[PDB]
């Protein structure tokens, strides 16, 4: 088999999130108020921030 395998129809993600979301691979930023670098020692995948809003009842995000 080829090693380049697309597994989008198998993972169960809706197609809108496949064609719309952008994925950022980054090393997380060090907290500038703290000298420790243990949480820096990994890479991580995070997804692009969409719209948050205030619900009209009580004020949550």
């Amino acid at each position: 088999v080829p090693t380049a395998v697309n597994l989008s129809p198998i993972s169960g993600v809706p197609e809108e999130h496949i064609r719309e979301r952008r994925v950022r691979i980054h090393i997380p930023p060090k907290n500038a108020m703290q000298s420790g670098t243990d949480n820096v020692n990994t890479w991580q995948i995070e997804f692009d921030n969409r719209e948050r809003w205030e619900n009209p009842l009580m004020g949550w995000a």
Partner: protein, 115 residues
């Protein structure tokens, strides 16, 4: 590149195509028993058109293990539709009958909301 893996129910592409056509035949036979039993507001021809659209949106894949995983999942939905094993609320989930459609032009998307 190249990789040696264990296969899933088929060695080459022709057997996977035969399994997909067997899924289409079994789903065609299972649609008129789905319509008369599940109490859904969908005509048999609309059900067959939806089955055709479900196969069309998975025509684009080429890898045989992905195709055979899709065959295994479609066989699971067939087995969950031969025995009833489900309600009318989950059969209509393929049609997405409750979601209002969203426009695709940039002006209407600009007017409505940031999504």
């Amino acid at each position: 590149a190249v990789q040696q893996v264990r296969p899933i129910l088929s060695v080459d592409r022709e057997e996977a195509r035969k399994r997909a056509l067997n899924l289409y035949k079994a789903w065609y036979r299972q649609i008129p028993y789905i319509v008369m039993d599940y109490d859904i507001p969908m005509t048999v021809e609309q059900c067959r058109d939806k089955l055709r659209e479900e196969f069309v949106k998975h025509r684009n894949v080429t890898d045989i293990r992905v195709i055979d995983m899709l065959v295994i999942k479609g066989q699971m939905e067939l087995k969950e539709s031969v025995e009833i094993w489900k309600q009318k609320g989950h059969i209509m989930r393929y049609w997405k009958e409750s979601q209002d459609p969203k426009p695709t032009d940039f002006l209407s998307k600009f007017i409505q909301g940031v999504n």
